[PDB]
Design a protein around this ligand. Sequence first.
Ligand SMILES: *[C@@H]1O[C@H](CO)[C@@H](O)[C@H](O)[C@H]1NC(C)=O
Ligand SMILES: *[C@@H]1O[C@H](CO)[C@@H](O)[C@H](O)[C@H]1NC(C)=O
Ligand SMILES: *[C@@H]1O[C@H](CO)[C@@H](O)[C@H](O)[C@H]1NC(C)=O
Ligand SMILES: *[C@@H]1O[C@H](CO)[C@@H](O)[C@H](O)[C@H]1NC(C)=O
Lengths: 106, 172, 171, 172, 52
Amino acid sequence: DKICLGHHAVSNGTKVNTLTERGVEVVNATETVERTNIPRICSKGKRTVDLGQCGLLGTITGPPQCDQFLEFSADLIIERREGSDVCYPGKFVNEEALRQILRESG
Amino acid sequence: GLFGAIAGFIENGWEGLIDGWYGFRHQNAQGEGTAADYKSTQSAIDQITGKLNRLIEKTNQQFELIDNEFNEVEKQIGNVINWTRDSITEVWSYNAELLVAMENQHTIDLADSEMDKLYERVKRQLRENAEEDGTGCFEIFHKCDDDCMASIRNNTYDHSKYREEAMQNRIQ
Amino acid sequence: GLFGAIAGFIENGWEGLIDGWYGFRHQNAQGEGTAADYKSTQSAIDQITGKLNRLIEKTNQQFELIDNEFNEVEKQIGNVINWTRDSITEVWSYNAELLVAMENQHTIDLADSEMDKLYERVKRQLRENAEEDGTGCFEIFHKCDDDCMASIRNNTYDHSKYREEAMQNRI
Amino acid sequence: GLFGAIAGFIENGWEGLIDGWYGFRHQNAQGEGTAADYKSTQSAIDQITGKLNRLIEKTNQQFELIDNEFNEVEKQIGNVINWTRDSITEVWSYNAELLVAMENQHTIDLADSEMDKLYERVKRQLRENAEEDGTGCFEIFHKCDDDCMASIRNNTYDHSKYREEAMQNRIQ
Amino acid sequence: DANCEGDCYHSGGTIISNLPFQNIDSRAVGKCPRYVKQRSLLLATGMKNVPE
Ligand SMILES: *[C@@H]1O[C@H](CO)[C@@H](O)[C@H](O)[C@H]1NC(C)=O
Ligand SMILES: *[C@@H]1O[C@H](CO)[C@@H](O)[C@H](O)[C@H]1NC(C)=O
Ligand SMILES: *[C@@H]1O[C@H](CO)[C@@H](O)[C@H](O)[C@H]1NC(C)=O
Ligand SMILES: *[C@@H]1O[C@H](CO)[C@@H](O)[C@H](O)[C@H]1NC(C)=O
């Protein structure tokens, strides 16, 4: 009479890397690096402001595009590529600092 | 492995055993039989779980924009930022690849230990009633029916009630 | 717990063993006894100590100020200085929690080994004059008085001077 | 942790064993002889090699010059860079010095593990024809000629052929 | 989209994931997995596979 004791295995396993070897088959592995993107701003339950054609600095001065964003209140602020802060041409001294102030302004 | 029983003297795994990770396969008068060992299999699964619960559902920190994709920031500061970010990416890329190798090396040896712990425990139950060939088997030297086999599994084997019989066949 | 012998075949620790970390507990006709083993105990302590000398009391570079609590700096350079510091704090926090987790994991297995190494030394001391109980005990098949138990402890046990009875009693 | 092999119950190494890393050294009627075991010696080498292959000569990111050795940059931006550079340099040294030790610790227990794997292999090979001395030797209880020790090495040893003679000499 | 909830935004969308590392945008903002150059780092969740 014999009694023998062993471990399980599978036909097609997954190769992994270790301290000491490349491509060593194992029973199961799972991924550690996320690659699946969601092509949308997921904004469930977040007070969101989509500035659109309004530039984030245009909320301070109020050019015609930003007439609807003079006193907004948000948790998530979105700038779009078509946003222009100005109507009469000009630019803000220290623009980005003021933008960084406004993005976390609420 | 590190304890040499996943590649050392257990030659291969048992693709049929889907009951668990580690288990018994006996042969006796009544015939063949295969069962898995819960107390061992769960000891390694509870351990991999610890690792996963440590790498997954981390609550990472909140970071803000310092760059601008639409209106590029000043050059000299844009380079200090591009430079700094590129450096941190080195660290994390290194930290990520090293951590997995550390963990994957550990898990692969960790499973060995559970095999050797099972093996070297069953052997002690059969104190002088059996001898180990060295393939992961135990040559039993007495009549071990399918109840005697299940006796071994749930650790009810009374080595004394077979000893005098076993010792006899051992020396002749 | 890679070697067994702490949660393994060894049932539980002895709270009474205050001499060292590992030890012997013998039972024979002359009575009872319990003593420590210097070799195994000191060989783990020496290791655990070596870890402490590797983390404790290590000097670091001098870092000066680039911020200001009172007269705040310009914002654009501030959010950069902050974004960098917050990014290094992640690195050193991850390095800390990981180092200690890896450190403890090796520490605990480090004590398994030294337990198991002690158990295996004794087993080959008494060669065929004793059998493996399974709970960390050795059923000696020859009368081993308190002077003989002392021989096992200090590694003066000569198995040939008892090897004769031994085998006669195992059969 | 460690295994008992290297510093433990094997007292010293063999400065005369240049054939490999691990090896046999029997003694018998016809003399003394020493030969290396290929499978274990290569098994360790295939492992340390796997470590170097991970450290030596790997793509390293291209980094550029934010600083200036001839015309020093502004003191305020320059103190941020000097600070960022020094903060990373600590990271890269914590990582390196830790990595080398974490590997050195693993490598030293690695080779230790391979010896025990050799030792406990041979034990099983001579089921009951030998007892372990405890210094890393096996007192063999039959007569083992040169083509016997060689059969022990290349794993052709049939223990059933020598067992009866062996089991007699032991118990007495 | 108000149907999904995410906390890691980049110029191309949201990253909703429990993994520690990401490989989607190095400039992603919010509560994000940290960026790695590697495309995939597989963590072992089983033993050495020794088949017949
Ligand atoms: C195997 O790993 C994959 C990785 O995604 C996981 O989804 C699956 O649940 C795992 N299966 C088992 C049986 O572990
Ligand atoms: C900084 O990197 C971004 C991409 O990450 C690039 O578009 C920009 O031109 C870079 N700025 C400088 C000054 O190199
Ligand atoms: C940087 O962080 C500190 C807290 O550590 C905060 O008080 C300070 O306002 C931050 N810097 C800026 C420019 O907001
Ligand atoms: C930065 O460090 C360099 C040496 O690496 C030194 O020459 C220079 O004076 C330092 N700059 C500042 C502003 O401390």
